[PDB]
Amino acid sequence: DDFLVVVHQIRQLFQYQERPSQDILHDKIIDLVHLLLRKYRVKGLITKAEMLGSVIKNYEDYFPEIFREASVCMQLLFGIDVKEVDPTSHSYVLVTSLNLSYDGIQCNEQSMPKSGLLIIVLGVIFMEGNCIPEEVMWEVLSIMGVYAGREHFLFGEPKRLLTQNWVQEKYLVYRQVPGTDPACYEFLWGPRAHAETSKMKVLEYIANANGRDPTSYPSLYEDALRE
């Protein structure tokens, strides 16, 4: 599909409790996202001068917009943050969002970062009160085009990714629901999730996705303070 379509759908997904068009600027944002993904993989530094030279060229006057849109894509789609390390040379580095120690690449140049989807899953569990029926998780993920039993063009097979990979990584718990027979399944945060982030940091990420303040999620804000 399209990186920016999926970004738009991720912002919809986070509003579940309440479209990009093809032009030159769209192409310049995708090309920059590709360049930023290349630098992330080798922890390469990138400058504003490199971004102009290799991608922006004759759209220098749209640089602020293209960089902002590309930076939003890197975060919400790939869980990569763009951080300024030198204001004078306009030098930036690419690090994993919420400082998670996982991106699912594992020195593999096919693989797309999975930290974006991991943060969304942790968010959704949080959003449903820190324990979510499996079927409700799949319903919410359907909003961003992620489906159990279907190969996803960025993230691979989500059913295995959530119930296997992220259980073995201890980001998630996936278990039989107590009192159910025959058996239903639920997700919670795993111990690595609690060790690497907090409810309030995840609420801020969620809120920021749609330009909203965390306080505008009153129940989730109160739950995040209970920590």
Curated annotation (Swiss-Prot):
Transmembrane segments: none
Intracellular or extracellular location(s): Nucleus; Cytoplasm
Organ and tissue specificity: Expressed in tumors of several types, such as melanoma, head and neck squamous cell carcinoma, lung carcinoma and breast carcinoma. Expressed in testis, ovary, prostate, cancerous prostate, breast and adrenal tissue.
Domain MAGE: 25-224
Protein function: Acts as androgen receptor coregulator that increases androgen receptor activity by modulating the receptors interdomain interaction. May play a role in embryonal development and tumor transformation or aspects of tumor progression.
Protein name: Melanoma-associated antigen 11
Species whose genome carries this gene: Homo sapiens (Human)
Gene: MAGEA11
